[PDB]
Design a protein around this ligand. Structure first.
Ligand SMILES: NCc1ncc(-c2ccc(F)cc2)[nH]1
Ligand SMILES: NCc1ncc(-c2ccc(F)cc2)[nH]1
Length: 330
């Protein structure tokens, strides 16, 4: 089998992307944030504290003839930015782009943090990291991809995120019309539960490529590109007036600037992030200080190849027995 679904930016900055997902019988369609940095499929629901729902579409398990309470199971997750959610668990039928999994764990939120309440466009998350990170207790549950994998034509999914435009998540096949040149594959460590890999270096603008190993994760659920302080300083030094602001929480730059591109290495291949992809706009409405899309990872403990980086590529998440990642230009 295969599936194919369009993913759409939630706002004019590409802060996140939402993909429609059918849950239950008859189908209830929710728009979920596909997150290769976590491993829980959780939704706003009829059980979510009413004051914490503000415009989201909710899953109502009592209206689904295929929903079953997973007795005794609870979940609770905290994300790298400090957001969080928790609740109980149903199993139900879940379909993405025509690909159907029966018996998928659908984690129903009883509580969500304010950041989620405020994102009226995000009805929940669909985790696509390794199932070892799933938070369901006392019986850990499998991700949608792990449940689907044996049925897929090939044990892969691909992320093709758009810049200020829709893109595509495919399951079970590699659309050879969706990228240019060849796909370069690179090794993955699953020891931390992430799609963790090692970039071979970077360049700033038209500058020379610096060969240096940068270990990090491919994370569709993170907006920005978080890299070591040395790398990020070298980038922003090329932008007149750019500075790290403790009060704002990262590098800012004059909105009048034209930003240089940033290149990262995948083996001997190179992915170029255009400068415009690194502009996240005014820090507050009407400000002439703009927020940078490349930020330091120093306070995080891991480097994160988030949407800023991934949207410049066609990305293969290869879930074969030994997983690997593939990157192509597009
Ligand atoms: N840097 C602060 C900030 N401004 C907007 C966001 C944001 C992030 C994710 C999301 F889904 C929606 C909005 N974060
Ligand atoms: N209210 C704005 C906002 N700040 C962080 C988030 C967020 C969105 C998606 C995600 F996966 C994790 C955090 N949204």
């Amino acid at each position: 089998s295969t599936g194919s679904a369009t993913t759409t930016p939630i706002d004019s900055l590409d802060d996140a992307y939402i993909t429609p997902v059918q849950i239950g019988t008859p189908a209830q369609t929710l728009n979920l944030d596909f997150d290769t940095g976590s491993s829980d499929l959780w939704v706003f629901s009829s059980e979510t504290t009413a004051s914490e729902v503000d415009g989201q579409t909710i899953y109502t398990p009592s209206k689904s003839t295929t929903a079953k309470l997973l007795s005794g199971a609870t979940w609770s997750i905290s994300y790298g930015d400090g957001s969080s959610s928790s609740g109980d668990v149903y199993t139900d039928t879940v379909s993405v782009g025509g690909l159907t999994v029966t018996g998928q764990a659908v984690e129903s939120a009883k509580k969500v943090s304010s950041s989620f309440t405020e994102d009226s466009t995000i009805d929940g998350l669909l985790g696509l990291a390794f199932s070892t990170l799933n938070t369901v207790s006392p019986t850990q549950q499998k991700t949608f991809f792990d449940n689907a994998k044996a049925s897929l034509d090939s044990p892969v999914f691909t992320a093709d995120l758009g810049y200020h435009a829709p893109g595509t998540y495919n399951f079970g096949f590699i659309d050879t019309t969706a990228y240019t040149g060849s796909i370069t594959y690179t090794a993955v460590s699953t020891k931390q539960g992430f799609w963790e890999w090692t970039s071979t270096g970077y360049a700033v603008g038209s500058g020379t490529f610096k060969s240096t190993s940068i270990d990090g994760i491919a994370d569709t659920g993170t907006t920005l590109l978080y890299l070591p302080a040395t790398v990020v300083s070298a980038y922003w030094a090329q932008v007149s007036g750019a500075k790290s602001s403790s009060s704002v929480g990262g590098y800012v730059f004059p909105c009048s600037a034209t930003l240089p591109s940033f290149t990262f290495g995948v083996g001997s291949a190179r992915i170029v992030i255009p400068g415009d992809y690194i502009d996240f706009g005014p820090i507050s409405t009407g400000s002439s200080s703009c927020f940078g899309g490349i930020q330091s990872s120093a306070g995080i403990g891991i480097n994160i190849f988030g949407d800023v980086a991934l949207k410049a590529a066609f990305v293969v998440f290869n879930g074969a027995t030994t997983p690997t990642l593939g990157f192509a230009s597009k």
